[PDB]
Amino acid sequence: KPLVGTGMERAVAVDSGVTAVAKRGGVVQYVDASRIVIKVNEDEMYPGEAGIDIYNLTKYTRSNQNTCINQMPCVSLGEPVERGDVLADGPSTDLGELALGQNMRVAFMPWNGYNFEDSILVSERVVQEDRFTTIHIQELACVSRDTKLGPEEITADIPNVGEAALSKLDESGIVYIGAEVTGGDILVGKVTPKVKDSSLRVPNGVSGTVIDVQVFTRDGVEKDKRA
Amino acid sequence: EFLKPRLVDIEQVSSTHAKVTLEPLERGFGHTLGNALRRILLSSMPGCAVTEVEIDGVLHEYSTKEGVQEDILEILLNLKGLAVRVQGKDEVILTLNKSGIGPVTAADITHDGDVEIVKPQHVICHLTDENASISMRIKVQRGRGYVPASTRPIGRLLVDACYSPVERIAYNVEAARVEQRTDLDKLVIEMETNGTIDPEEAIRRAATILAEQLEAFV
Amino acid sequence: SVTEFLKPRLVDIEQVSSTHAKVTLEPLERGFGHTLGNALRRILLSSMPGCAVTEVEIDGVLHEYSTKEGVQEDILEILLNLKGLAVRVQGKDEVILTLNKSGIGPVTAADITHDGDVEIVKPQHVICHLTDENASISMRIKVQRGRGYVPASTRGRLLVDACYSPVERIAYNVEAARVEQRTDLDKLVIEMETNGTIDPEEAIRRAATILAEQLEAFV
Amino acid sequence: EIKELLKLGDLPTSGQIRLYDGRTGEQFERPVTVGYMYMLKLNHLVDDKM
Amino acid sequence: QDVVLGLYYMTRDCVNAKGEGMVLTGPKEAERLYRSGLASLHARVKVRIT
């Protein structure tokens, strides 16, 4: 929420569709992390259908730039809202106002050359408060192609590796949801006929948590247990 | 010779922040001791921060739980901000079980009589509907400094460790017109703790650290 | 496990002529190099026991901006020469010494009367040069024990800036140290010169003793 | 108006406060300009550039 | 840019400061006076330069 704004933050945040602006005013009935329910006022309720609004918030999902899109409710239970009020603030939005960065206590002074030409000097309090910490969601695809000399299987039986390396996989060769895989870990076990190891693995230097796994199967291929 | 300073007063203003006094001091020793103690206190003080959490129906911190409006990541942030004092142990596992509409604060944690929560009003999350219940296990452990999860079951959520009770330390050197002698200094140390460290104990530990570091060449 | 820190040790003491030394300390805890170095530097250059020439009176000089026949230098330069006169005194606090000399040649520190318990560590320390034979230099320098540096502006007798502290220049330079796996640490480097009254290592040990005695009421 | 709003709090009109060095503890002369600036983190991260 | 600013501020003078006109026995005494607060960084003094 920029301390020194220009007043255009709310217009930019609302007009761009990232928040959950209430379609019809009313009273908030239910608020969880991923859903908001609004009981519309009798004055704004059409004759006939009753007649309440359900806003399904889009939780952690990947943007085009591998950032995080995550709408958070900004209203409490039993709180009146009117037409055109934000109910959930998306990414880089605070109570319906555009909020890109964070406002921090700055001092203009040379400091032993650590801000020599154009550099910044940052305290450990900024990194402890986790205020410039960002979430980056990455999508990695493993495809089994109908190649010559035999097709590709997504089994967990992989040579040249031990059982400690395959312990993070399930019985179907796909990593569990929530496993803290790091660089070099095997996400999706896949082998190609000659057999050789061609499994999808995390790129080196990349850590993180597997948050969602999607399996797409062509028609008539007898999807495995995990699918 | 050099008069020896001693802890003459501890003015505890509020629960969080306190104001200690050292008197007397010779010329220049006020600033020397003030800055040395301020750096020691801001650097090395034992704390009892949270390290691991385990919510039952939650696999990873980037998910949501039905009936709780906070995201699991926001719950982990609120737990990271939790101030707690453990006395007889180094690590301890607090248990939180709460159901029904309302704010789940820190007062709902199982007492664990050797472990004291110093801010019972600290809201951890919110439960929206009556048929919702949360049950989590919070690993509060003793440490020093700031240890992120990058340095150190698929259902265990690791939080960044911030075992530093003090939040703000300031010192002021004033003139202590006492003992029928002028040009003597008095050091007033205003410290802002989270409530889990007694100011006299903080000053004592800070002086002990300096005394131990000075043993390299004396 | 949260009480004991990386207590350092004197891993290197490289020195030059006995009025100069360079002492290294590693590996200190992250940030402790700066606090230890600042505390030691402040205690050494501000509050250290010592004795130095406090004020000198001349036979026929009544003002700092004056003259004396047969002397190459001026009163200001003789005051400067007397300020850097290293002197060591016994249990007595203050002592007045007399310097009388006639003849062509330099006047070193050994030319002061040898009677007394006061020891001069730099006998060849030139005080003044006189060019003629008729004129004779005669002065009384009163030295006293003090608590560091006290200039003459902080109030037939002339005032000299008293520099009691044995140190001349002290600097510290916190570098980066290394352990088997820990990286963010400190490597203190104290570089100290003295006037010759005491050893630089003795000065460091005395400063550590002072700083530890200041903390005996807490630990 | 900025000066008046600073004066509404207990803050100096000039916008500069005396600041003390963290390491040595000595005060910086020439009071420095302190305030709150709204800093942004651009999408140019060193772990994606190394 | 920062080195030149530091060297310009250090090698400078003002009409009246702490320790104006005092006589110094060398650069070491000048540093010992500045670091102890008994003299300003830019104060006109007579030093002995070899």
Curated annotation (Swiss-Prot), chain A:
It comes from the Bacteria. Signal peptide: none annotated. Coiled coil: none annotated. DNA-dependent RNA polymerase catalyzes the transcription of DNA into RNA using the four ribonucleoside triphosphates as substrates. The RNAP catalytic core consists of 2 alpha, 1 beta, 1 beta' and 1 omega subunit. When a sigma factor is associated with the core the holoenzyme is formed, which can initiate transcription. Belongs to the RNA polymerase beta chain family. This is DNA-directed RNA polymerase subunit beta. The chain holds residues 697 to 945 of 1342 of the full protein.
Swiss-Prot record, chain C:
The keyword Nucleotidyltransferase applies. One of its GO terms (molecular function) is DNA-directed RNA polymerase activity. One of its GO terms (biological process) is DNA-templated transcription. Its EC number is 2.7.7.6. It comes from the Bacteria. It catalyses: RNA(n) + a ribonucleoside 5'-triphosphate = RNA(n+1) + diphosphate. Keywords: DNA-directed RNA polymerase, Nucleotidyltransferase, Transcription, Transferase. Residues 1-219 are annotated as: Alpha N-terminal domain (alpha-NTD). GO terms for cellular component: cytoplasm; DNA-directed RNA polymerase complex. Homodimer. The RNAP catalytic core consists of 2 alpha, 1 beta, 1 beta' and 1 omega subunit. When a sigma factor is associated with the core the holoenzyme is formed, which can initiate transcription. The N-terminal domain is essential for RNAP assembly and basal transcription, whereas the C-terminal domain is involved in interaction with transcriptional regulators and with upstream promoter elements. DNA-dependent RNA polymerase catalyzes the transcription of DNA into RNA using the four ribonucleoside triphosphates as substrates. Belongs to the RNA polymerase alpha chain family. This is DNA-directed RNA polymerase subunit alpha. The chain holds residues 4 to 232 of 329 of the full protein.
